[PDB]
Amino acid sequence: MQGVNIYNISAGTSVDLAAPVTTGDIVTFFSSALNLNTTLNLFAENGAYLLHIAFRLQENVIIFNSRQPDGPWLVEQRVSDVANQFAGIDGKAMVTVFDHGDKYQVVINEKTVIQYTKQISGLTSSLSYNATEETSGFSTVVEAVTYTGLA
Amino acid sequence: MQGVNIYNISAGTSVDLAAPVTTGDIVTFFSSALNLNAGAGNPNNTTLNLFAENGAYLLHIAFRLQENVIIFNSRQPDGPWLVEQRVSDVANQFAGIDGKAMVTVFDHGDKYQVVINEKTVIQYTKQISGLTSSLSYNATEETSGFSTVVEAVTYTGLA
């Protein structure tokens, strides 16, 4: 049934989802810091990177990509100008990802930044937030709320 | 299309939704404070509301600390409160999270599902239908049990 699950993920760690994120489900990451490194990931149970999100502060670009458990990085999609996507909110931020089945729609705050057509499919059984335990643009701890069982 | 909208609602105010909330949509209220004790002598302030454009109270949520119960009810723009639904033991619904809280409302069409943090507390069958065009959070000036400012995030265009 439709449900809400709360998680706390400190940089450099991951969490196993009590309720998997599948088609029709949503997951939102909340940062209590926003100083513009940091990557948000959705994992398949076999260890595949369903969706990799890397905010490149030096290049000032947001990267999106997938990866097989024993394969390398695949075709990446990029969005230009990091600061622009978070434009509208200072000192904090949120990243939302909708699993639409054929693709993942990524939203930063209220702005949709990309309709990422999947390179790898499956259900998200875990998530992680690396900032390499160093924490960069986001707070050292990200709160992840998921809304599952929507379909 | 599927979107996300963020609102900042102070106690005693309301906001009109940029994107209405209808069947299949979700709204979540985040509180920075969680004091569930009658810290004065009037544990009735804490209320969350989903409004219909005609002013109807689609869903009225009232956290009653003194009686120690959570009430759910609706009301026509020109009528009185209707058939009240209640959930006893307020504090036990927020069990698992201290110093904060989350209240989520799912619009399923014929009902409203309310979840406090991770626990579903009621499948409230609608007494009034329609789409949510505005929301309000009352502590009517005062603080009540939640932070004097509630953040509201809506997920719309889901259907």
Curated annotation (Swiss-Prot), chain A:
Root EC class: hydrolase
InterPro entries registered for this protein in UniProt: ConA-like_dom_sf (IPR013320), Galectin_CRD (IPR001079)
Any one GO biological process: positive regulation of apoptotic process
Ranges for domain Galectin: 13-148
Keywords noted in UniProt: Apoptosis, Hydrolase, Lectin, Nuclease
Positions with a binding annotation for N-acetyl-alpha-neuraminyl-(2->3)-beta-D-galactosyl-(1->4)-beta-D-glucose: H52, R56, N65, R67, W73, E76
Chain positions found as Blocked amino end (Gln): Q2
Expression (tissue specificity): Detected in the fruiting body.
Pfam assignment, any one: Gal-bind_lectin
Any one Gene Ontology molecular-function term assigned to this protein's record: DNA nuclease activity
SMART domains on file: GLECT
EC numbers for this chain: 3.1.21.-
Binding partners and assembly: Homodimer.
Role of this protein: Anti-tumor lectin with DNase activity. Inhibits the growth of several tumor cell lines in vitro. Induces lymphocyte infiltration and necrosis of tumor cells in a mouse tumor model. Induces apoptosis in HeLa cells. Binds N-acetylneuraminyl lactose (N-acetyl-alpha-neuraminyl-(2->3)-beta-D-galactosyl-(1->4)-beta-D-glucose).
Protein name: Anti-tumor lectin
UniProtKB/Swiss-Prot annotation, chain B:
Tissue: Detected in the fruiting body.
Documented EC number(s): 3.1.21.-
MF terms in GO: DNA nuclease activity; polysaccharide binding
Keywords per UniProt: Apoptosis, Hydrolase, Lectin, Nuclease
Top-rank taxon, per record: Eukaryota
Residues annotated with Blocked amino end (Gln) modification: Q2
Binding locations of N-acetyl-alpha-neuraminyl-(2->3)-beta-D-galactosyl-(1->4)-beta-D-glucose: N44, H60, R64, N73, R75, W81, E84
Residue span(s) of domain Galectin: 13-156
PROSITE patterns (alphabetical): GALECTIN
GO biological process: apoptotic process; positive regulation of apoptotic process
Pfam families: Gal-bind_lectin
InterPro entries referenced in this protein's UniProt entry, alphabetically: ConA-like_dom_sf, Galectin_CRD
Function per UniProt: Anti-tumor lectin with DNase activity. Inhibits the growth of several tumor cell lines in vitro. Induces lymphocyte infiltration and necrosis of tumor cells in a mouse tumor model. Induces apoptosis in HeLa cells. Binds N-acetylneuraminyl lactose (N-acetyl-alpha-neuraminyl-(2->3)-beta-D-galactosyl-(1->4)-beta-D-glucose).
Oligomeric form and interacting partners: Homodimer.
Name of this chain's protein: Anti-tumor lectin
Record organism: Cyclocybe aegerita (Black poplar mushroom)
